[PDB]
mmCIF file of all heavy atoms in Angstrom:
data_model
loop_
_atom_site.group_PDB
_atom_site.id
_atom_site.type_symbol
_atom_site.label_atom_id
_atom_site.label_comp_id
_atom_site.label_asym_id
_atom_site.label_seq_id
_atom_site.Cartn_x
_atom_site.Cartn_y
_atom_site.Cartn_z
ATOM 1 N N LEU A 1 135.327 148.295 264.232
ATOM 2 C CA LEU A 1 136.036 149.252 263.369
ATOM 3 C C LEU A 1 135.229 150.522 263.061
ATOM 4 O O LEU A 1 134.034 150.449 262.763
ATOM 5 C CB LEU A 1 136.418 148.587 262.044
ATOM 6 C CG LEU A 1 137.436 147.435 262.078
ATOM 7 C CD1 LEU A 1 137.590 146.817 260.706
ATOM 8 C CD2 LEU A 1 138.795 147.921 262.594
ATOM 9 N N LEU A 2 135.883 151.680 263.119
ATOM 10 C CA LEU A 2 135.253 152.948 262.727
ATOM 11 C C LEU A 2 136.045 153.659 261.624
ATOM 12 O O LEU A 2 137.235 153.912 261.784
ATOM 13 C CB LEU A 2 135.107 153.892 263.936
ATOM 14 C CG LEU A 2 134.140 153.528 265.069
ATOM 15 C CD1 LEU A 2 134.817 152.663 266.121
ATOM 16 C CD2 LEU A 2 133.523 154.793 265.717
ATOM 17 N N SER A 3 135.378 154.010 260.527
ATOM 18 C CA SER A 3 136.023 154.740 259.435
ATOM 19 C C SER A 3 136.084 156.255 259.683
ATOM 20 O O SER A 3 135.055 156.921 259.778
ATOM 21 C CB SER A 3 135.265 154.494 258.132
ATOM 22 O OG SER A 3 135.411 153.153 257.712
ATOM 23 N N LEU A 4 137.301 156.782 259.785
ATOM 24 C CA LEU A 4 137.538 158.220 259.938
ATOM 25 C C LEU A 4 137.541 158.991 258.621
ATOM 26 O O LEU A 4 137.860 158.437 257.572
ATOM 27 C CB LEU A 4 138.853 158.473 260.686
ATOM 28 C CG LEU A 4 138.855 158.224 262.196
ATOM 29 C CD1 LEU A 4 138.147 156.933 262.525
ATOM 30 C CD2 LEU A 4 140.272 158.188 262.726
ATOM 31 N N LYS A 5 137.203 160.276 258.696
ATOM 32 C CA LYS A 5 137.273 161.186 257.546
ATOM 33 C C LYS A 5 138.647 161.225 256.874
ATOM 34 O O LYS A 5 138.742 161.303 255.651
ATOM 35 C CB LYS A 5 136.928 162.613 257.978
ATOM 36 C CG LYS A 5 135.464 162.869 258.256
ATOM 37 C CD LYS A 5 134.689 163.080 256.977
ATOM 38 C CE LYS A 5 133.241 163.424 257.284
ATOM 39 N NZ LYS A 5 132.354 163.044 256.147
ATOM 40 N N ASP A 6 139.706 161.203 257.677
ATOM 41 C CA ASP A 6 141.064 161.293 257.154
ATOM 42 C C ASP A 6 141.518 160.025 256.417
ATOM 43 O O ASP A 6 142.592 160.005 255.817
ATOM 44 C CB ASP A 6 142.055 161.651 258.267
ATOM 45 C CG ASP A 6 142.159 160.569 259.329
ATOM 46 O OD1 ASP A 6 141.518 159.505 259.171
ATOM 47 O OD2 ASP A 6 142.894 160.782 260.320
ATOM 48 N N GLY A 7 140.708 158.971 256.469
ATOM 49 C CA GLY A 7 140.958 157.784 255.675
ATOM 50 C C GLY A 7 141.570 156.626 256.437
ATOM 51 O O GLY A 7 141.745 155.543 255.876
ATOM 52 N N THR A 8 141.901 156.841 257.708
ATOM 53 C CA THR A 8 142.367 155.743 258.544
ATOM 54 C C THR A 8 141.168 155.045 259.194
ATOM 55 O O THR A 8 140.023 155.496 259.072
ATOM 56 C CB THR A 8 143.313 156.240 259.660
ATOM 57 O OG1 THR A 8 142.598 157.111 260.545
ATOM 58 C CG2 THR A 8 144.513 156.994 259.080
ATOM 59 N N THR A 9 141.440 153.961 259.913
ATOM 60 C CA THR A 9 140.406 153.252 260.656
ATOM 61 C C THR A 9 140.930 152.936 262.064
ATOM 62 O O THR A 9 142.092 152.579 262.235
ATOM 63 C CB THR A 9 139.967 151.938 259.925
ATOM 64 O OG1 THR A 9 139.645 152.212 258.552
ATOM 65 C CG2 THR A 9 138.756 151.317 260.602
ATOM 66 N N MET A 10 140.078 153.069 263.072
ATOM 67 C CA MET A 10 140.476 152.742 264.441
ATOM 68 C C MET A 10 139.400 151.875 265.059
ATOM 69 O O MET A 10 138.243 151.934 264.648
ATOM 70 C CB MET A 10 140.634 154.021 265.287
ATOM 71 C CG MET A 10 141.685 154.994 264.784
ATOM 72 S SD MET A 10 141.691 156.603 265.645
ATOM 73 C CE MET A 10 142.407 156.173 267.231
ATOM 74 N N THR A 11 139.770 151.068 266.044
ATOM 75 C CA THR A 11 138.765 150.386 266.835
ATOM 76 C C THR A 11 138.142 151.345 267.862
ATOM 77 O O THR A 11 138.734 152.369 268.208
ATOM 78 C CB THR A 11 139.347 149.196 267.570
ATOM 79 O OG1 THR A 11 140.242 149.660 268.583
ATOM 80 C CG2 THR A 11 140.086 148.254 266.579
ATOM 81 N N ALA A 12 136.945 151.009 268.337
ATOM 82 C CA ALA A 12 136.294 151.781 269.388
ATOM 83 C C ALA A 12 137.203 151.901 270.600
ATOM 84 O O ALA A 12 137.311 152.974 271.203
ATOM 85 C CB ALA A 12 134.975 151.131 269.788
ATOM 86 N N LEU A 13 137.856 150.799 270.964
ATOM 87 C CA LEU A 13 138.767 150.818 272.102
ATOM 88 C C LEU A 13 139.967 151.758 271.891
ATOM 89 O O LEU A 13 140.490 152.337 272.843
ATOM 90 C CB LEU A 13 139.244 149.404 272.433
ATOM 91 C CG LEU A 13 140.452 149.347 273.377
ATOM 92 C CD1 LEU A 13 140.056 149.831 274.775
ATOM 93 C CD2 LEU A 13 141.050 147.929 273.423
ATOM 94 N N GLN A 14 140.405 151.901 270.645
ATOM 95 C CA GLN A 14 141.543 152.759 270.329
ATOM 96 C C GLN A 14 141.196 154.252 270.411
ATOM 97 O O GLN A 14 142.028 155.070 270.813
ATOM 98 C CB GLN A 14 142.118 152.408 268.948
ATOM 99 C CG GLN A 14 142.965 151.133 268.939
ATOM 100 C CD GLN A 14 143.432 150.747 267.547
ATOM 101 O OE1 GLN A 14 142.674 150.829 266.580
ATOM 102 N NE2 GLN A 14 144.698 150.337 267.435
ATOM 103 N N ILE A 15 139.978 154.612 270.019
ATOM 104 C CA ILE A 15 139.520 156.003 270.164
ATOM 105 C C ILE A 15 139.461 156.395 271.633
ATOM 106 O O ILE A 15 139.937 157.465 272.022
ATOM 107 C CB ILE A 15 138.156 156.213 269.492
ATOM 108 C CG1 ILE A 15 138.337 156.193 267.979
ATOM 109 C CG2 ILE A 15 137.498 157.536 269.940
ATOM 110 C CD1 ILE A 15 137.054 155.994 267.212
ATOM 111 N N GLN A 16 138.879 155.525 272.450
ATOM 112 C CA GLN A 16 138.847 155.744 273.891
ATOM 113 C C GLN A 16 140.248 155.843 274.487
ATOM 114 O O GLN A 16 140.499 156.715 275.311
ATOM 115 C CB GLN A 16 138.037 154.656 274.599
ATOM 116 C CG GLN A 16 136.529 154.849 274.493
ATOM 117 C CD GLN A 16 136.056 156.078 275.272
ATOM 118 O OE1 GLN A 16 136.580 156.387 276.348
ATOM 119 N NE2 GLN A 16 135.057 156.778 274.730
ATOM 120 N N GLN A 17 141.154 154.946 274.088
ATOM 121 C CA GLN A 17 142.534 155.005 274.574
ATOM 122 C C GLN A 17 143.183 156.340 274.255
ATOM 123 O O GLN A 17 143.867 156.919 275.091
ATOM 124 C CB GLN A 17 143.399 153.862 274.003
ATOM 125 C CG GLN A 17 143.140 152.513 274.677
ATOM 126 C CD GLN A 17 143.759 151.354 273.928
ATOM 127 O OE1 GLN A 17 143.825 151.360 272.698
ATOM 128 N NE2 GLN A 17 144.215 150.345 274.668
ATOM 129 N N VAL A 18 142.987 156.825 273.035
ATOM 130 C CA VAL A 18 143.617 158.080 272.641
ATOM 131 C C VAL A 18 142.995 159.274 273.377
ATOM 132 O O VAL A 18 143.697 160.192 273.793
ATOM 133 C CB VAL A 18 143.525 158.297 271.121
ATOM 134 C CG1 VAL A 18 144.034 159.687 270.755
ATOM 135 C CG2 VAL A 18 144.301 157.206 270.382
ATOM 136 N N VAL A 19 141.675 159.263 273.536
ATOM 137 C CA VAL A 19 141.011 160.336 274.265
ATOM 138 C C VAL A 19 141.469 160.313 275.719
ATOM 139 O O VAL A 19 141.853 161.341 276.263
ATOM 140 C CB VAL A 19 139.473 160.256 274.182
ATOM 141 C CG1 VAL A 19 138.832 161.314 275.104
ATOM 142 C CG2 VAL A 19 139.020 160.483 272.761
ATOM 143 N N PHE A 20 141.447 159.130 276.330
ATOM 144 C CA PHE A 20 141.896 158.966 277.714
ATOM 145 C C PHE A 20 143.355 159.381 277.938
ATOM 146 O O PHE A 20 143.681 160.013 278.955
ATOM 147 C CB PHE A 20 141.692 157.531 278.189
ATOM 148 C CG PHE A 20 142.490 157.182 279.409
ATOM 149 C CD1 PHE A 20 142.076 157.590 280.670
ATOM 150 C CD2 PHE A 20 143.658 156.445 279.300
ATOM 151 C CE1 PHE A 20 142.812 157.272 281.802
ATOM 152 C CE2 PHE A 20 144.405 156.120 280.430
ATOM 153 C CZ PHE A 20 143.980 156.536 281.681
ATOM 154 N N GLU A 21 144.232 159.028 276.998
ATOM 155 C CA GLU A 21 145.639 159.423 277.104
ATOM 156 C C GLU A 21 145.784 160.942 277.154
ATOM 157 O O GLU A 21 146.556 161.468 277.951
ATOM 158 C CB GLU A 21 146.484 158.829 275.963
ATOM 159 C CG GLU A 21 146.783 157.344 276.132
ATOM 160 C CD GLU A 21 146.953 156.600 274.799
ATOM 161 O OE1 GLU A 21 147.415 157.214 273.810
ATOM 162 O OE2 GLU A 21 146.618 155.394 274.743
ATOM 163 N N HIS A 22 145.034 161.650 276.313
ATOM 164 C CA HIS A 22 145.099 163.112 276.328
ATOM 165 C C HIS A 22 144.483 163.713 277.597
ATOM 166 O O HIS A 22 145.063 164.604 278.208
ATOM 167 C CB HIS A 22 144.460 163.713 275.077
ATOM 168 C CG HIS A 22 145.316 163.606 273.858
ATOM 169 N ND1 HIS A 22 145.447 162.437 273.139
ATOM 170 C CD2 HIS A 22 146.104 164.519 273.240
ATOM 171 C CE1 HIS A 22 146.266 162.637 272.123
ATOM 172 N NE2 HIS A 22 146.678 163.894 272.162
ATOM 173 N N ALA A 23 143.312 163.223 277.992
ATOM 174 C CA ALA A 23 142.696 163.672 279.236
ATOM 175 C C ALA A 23 143.695 163.578 280.389
ATOM 176 O O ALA A 23 143.686 164.400 281.301
ATOM 177 C CB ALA A 23 141.467 162.838 279.544
ATOM 178 N N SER A 24 144.541 162.555 280.346
ATOM 179 C CA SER A 24 145.517 162.319 281.402
ATOM 180 C C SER A 24 146.601 163.388 281.415
ATOM 181 O O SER A 24 147.112 163.754 282.473
ATOM 182 C CB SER A 24 146.162 160.942 281.233
ATOM 183 O OG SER A 24 145.179 159.924 281.263
ATOM 184 N N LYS A 25 146.977 163.866 280.234
ATOM 185 C CA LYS A 25 147.940 164.955 280.141
ATOM 186 C C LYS A 25 147.269 166.262 280.520
ATOM 187 O O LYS A 25 147.902 167.161 281.065
ATOM 188 C CB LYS A 25 148.508 165.059 278.727
ATOM 189 C CG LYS A 25 149.321 163.842 278.293
ATOM 190 C CD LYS A 25 150.327 163.439 279.362
ATOM 191 C CE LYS A 25 151.105 162.183 278.966
ATOM 192 N NZ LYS A 25 152.028 162.405 277.810
ATOM 193 N N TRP A 26 145.980 166.366 280.216
ATOM 194 C CA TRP A 26 145.248 167.576 280.505
ATOM 195 C C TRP A 26 145.224 167.780 282.007
ATOM 196 O O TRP A 26 145.470 168.882 282.495
ATOM 197 C CB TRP A 26 143.838 167.507 279.917
ATOM 198 C CG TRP A 26 142.925 168.535 280.481
ATOM 199 C CD1 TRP A 26 141.742 168.312 281.126
ATOM 200 C CD2 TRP A 26 143.116 169.954 280.472
ATOM 201 N NE1 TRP A 26 141.180 169.504 281.509
ATOM 202 C CE2 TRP A 26 142.003 170.528 281.122
ATOM 203 C CE3 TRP A 26 144.114 170.795 279.974
ATOM 204 C CZ2 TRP A 26 141.867 171.908 281.295
ATOM 205 C CZ3 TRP A 26 143.977 172.167 280.150
ATOM 206 C CH2 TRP A 26 142.863 172.709 280.799
ATOM 207 N N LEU A 27 144.969 166.703 282.748
ATOM 208 C CA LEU A 27 144.901 166.793 284.208
ATOM 209 C C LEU A 27 146.162 167.432 284.805
ATOM 210 O O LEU A 27 146.079 168.197 285.767
ATOM 211 C CB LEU A 27 144.631 165.424 284.843
ATOM 212 C CG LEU A 27 144.423 165.429 286.365
ATOM 213 C CD1 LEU A 27 143.373 166.468 286.787
ATOM 214 C CD2 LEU A 27 144.015 164.048 286.859
ATOM 215 N N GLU A 28 147.316 167.120 284.220
ATOM 216 C CA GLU A 28 148.588 167.695 284.654
ATOM 217 C C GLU A 28 148.608 169.215 284.564
ATOM 218 O O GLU A 28 149.236 169.878 285.382
ATOM 219 C CB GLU A 28 149.728 167.162 283.795
ATOM 220 C CG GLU A 28 149.958 165.686 283.884
ATOM 221 C CD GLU A 28 150.962 165.231 282.844
ATOM 222 O OE1 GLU A 28 151.361 166.075 282.011
ATOM 223 O OE2 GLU A 28 151.349 164.043 282.853
ATOM 224 N N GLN A 29 147.967 169.758 283.533
ATOM 225 C CA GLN A 29 147.908 171.202 283.340
ATOM 226 C C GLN A 29 146.621 171.865 283.832
ATOM 227 O O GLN A 29 146.494 173.082 283.742
ATOM 228 C CB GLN A 29 148.124 171.558 281.863
ATOM 229 C CG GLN A 29 149.556 171.409 281.372
ATOM 230 C CD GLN A 29 149.766 172.028 279.994
ATOM 231 O OE1 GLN A 29 149.796 171.327 278.981
ATOM 232 N NE2 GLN A 29 149.916 173.350 279.955
ATOM 233 N N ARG A 30 145.667 171.082 284.332
ATOM 234 C CA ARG A 30 144.332 171.616 284.649
ATOM 235 C C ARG A 30 144.336 172.595 285.828
ATOM 236 O O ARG A 30 144.620 172.205 286.971
ATOM 237 C CB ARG A 30 143.352 170.471 284.939
ATOM 238 C CG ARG A 30 141.874 170.877 285.027
ATOM 239 C CD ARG A 30 141.023 169.686 285.395
ATOM 240 N NE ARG A 30 139.592 169.978 285.391
ATOM 241 C CZ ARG A 30 138.867 170.190 286.486
ATOM 242 N NH1 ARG A 30 139.442 170.147 287.680
ATOM 243 N NH2 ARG A 30 137.563 170.440 286.387
ATOM 244 N N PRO A 31 144.009 173.873 285.561
ATOM 245 C CA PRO A 31 143.996 174.831 286.668
ATOM 246 C C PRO A 31 142.872 174.523 287.639
ATOM 247 O O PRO A 31 141.720 174.334 287.233
ATOM 248 C CB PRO A 31 143.754 176.181 285.973
ATOM 249 C CG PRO A 31 144.100 175.949 284.538
ATOM 250 C CD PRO A 31 143.704 174.523 284.277
ATOM 251 N N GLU A 32 143.218 174.480 288.920
ATOM 252 C CA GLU A 32 142.245 174.250 289.968
ATOM 253 C C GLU A 32 141.179 175.348 289.863
ATOM 254 O O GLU A 32 141.518 176.527 289.774
ATOM 255 C CB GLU A 32 142.963 174.303 291.315
ATOM 256 C CG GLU A 32 142.303 173.534 292.434
ATOM 257 C CD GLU A 32 142.236 172.043 292.159
ATOM 258 O OE1 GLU A 32 143.208 171.320 292.473
ATOM 259 O OE2 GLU A 32 141.201 171.594 291.634
ATOM 260 N N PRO A 33 139.887 174.967 289.829
ATOM 261 C CA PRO A 33 138.836 175.994 289.786
ATOM 262 C C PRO A 33 138.884 176.861 291.034
ATOM 263 O O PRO A 33 139.007 176.316 292.131
ATOM 264 C CB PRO A 33 137.532 175.182 289.779
ATOM 265 C CG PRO A 33 137.909 173.815 290.285
ATOM 266 C CD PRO A 33 139.336 173.601 289.853
ATOM 267 N N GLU A 34 138.783 178.177 290.860
ATOM 268 C CA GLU A 34 138.828 179.125 291.981
ATOM 269 C C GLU A 34 137.634 178.973 292.918
ATOM 270 O O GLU A 34 137.786 178.920 294.136
ATOM 271 C CB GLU A 34 138.866 180.559 291.458
ATOM 272 C CG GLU A 34 140.102 180.898 290.653
ATOM 273 C CD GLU A 34 141.340 181.055 291.516
ATOM 274 O OE1 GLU A 34 141.276 180.720 292.720
ATOM 275 O OE2 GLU A 34 142.377 181.516 290.991
ATOM 276 N N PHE A 35 136.444 178.904 292.335
ATOM 277 C CA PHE A 35 135.211 178.861 293.102
ATOM 278 C C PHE A 35 134.360 177.677 292.650
ATOM 279 O O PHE A 35 133.985 177.577 291.474
ATOM 280 C CB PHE A 35 134.454 180.174 292.899
ATOM 281 C CG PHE A 35 133.113 180.221 293.568
ATOM 282 C CD1 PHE A 35 133.009 180.490 294.920
ATOM 283 C CD2 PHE A 35 131.952 180.019 292.837
ATOM 284 C CE1 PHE A 35 131.778 180.543 295.537
ATOM 285 C CE2 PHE A 35 130.717 180.072 293.448
ATOM 286 C CZ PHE A 35 130.629 180.334 294.800
#
């Protein structure tokens, strides 16, 4: 368990899941590097 500033609590696995879920949406919009 990790205590957040906003007053909720998440598991370590849940923080990773949420970060990973967003990274996955980011990839959809990620501009291919020119160089």
